[PDB]
């Protein structure tokens, strides 16, 4: 990555710097904020896997629909259930004391997605 | 005037009794940033034991 002209070097520097905004601002923390134990990386990966599993079911149905209104309606119907579950998860994770509690809440949310979310999605897609 | 009328009696002594926080009895469909409020409520209800 060393060998390049001035323009290429400047472009590479720009691309690198546009990704370090998270690095620069991590030093500027606020004292009065309400801190919470964050969702762990493995739980994040499990939740994203559950979301991808949901997307696996909906893909043929949404790609075989030629109307944007139907796809938007399908998106809205699932999103209400997902938003209720997300609210439960956010409450129970913000009110968490240790990493065990955060893991418990994330596991409950993932289990809700993998157990009831897929059933609800299948019912919606059968309706469509 | 001439039928059943709901009563207005309530709990008027316990502090912060009607600051109800989220639970399975409220379905968690509230304002997103009210989670902080929940924590506050929790703390308050631990102060009065």
């Amino acid at each position: 990555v060393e060998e390049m002209d001035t323009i290429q070097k400047m472009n590479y520097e720009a691309t690198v710097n546009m990704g370090r905004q998270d690095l620069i601002t991590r030093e500027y923390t606020f004292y009065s904020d309400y801190e919470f134990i964050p969702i762990q990386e493995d739980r994040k990966q499990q939740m994203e896997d559950a979301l991808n599993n949901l997307h696996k079911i909906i893909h043929p149905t949404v790609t075989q629909l030629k109307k944007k209104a139907n796809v938007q309606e399908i998106q809205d119907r699932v999103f209400r259930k997902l938003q209720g579950w997300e609210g439960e998860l956010n409450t129970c994770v913000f009110s968490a004391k240790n990493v065990r509690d955060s893991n418990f809440c994330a596991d409950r949310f993932t289990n809700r997605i993998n157990t009831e979310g897929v059933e609800f999605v299948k019912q919606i897609l059968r309706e469509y | 005037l001439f039928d059943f009328n709901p009563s207005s009696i309530k709990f008027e002594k316990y502090p912060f009794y009607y600051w109800i926080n989220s639970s399975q009895l409220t379905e968690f469909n509230q304002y997103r940033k009210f989670v902080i409020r929940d924590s506050i409520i929790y703390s308050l209800n631990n102060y009065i034991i």
């Binding site: 409450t91 129970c92 509690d101 418990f104 | 989220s22 639970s23 929940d38 929790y42």
Partner: peptide
Amino acid sequence: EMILPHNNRQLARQYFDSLPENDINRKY
């Protein structure tokens, strides 16, 4: 709000175990 099961102190169970054998709560 719900208390998580691992953070839940079964104080009701502790009082229940301390009840006499011939008790209305045990009958319930």
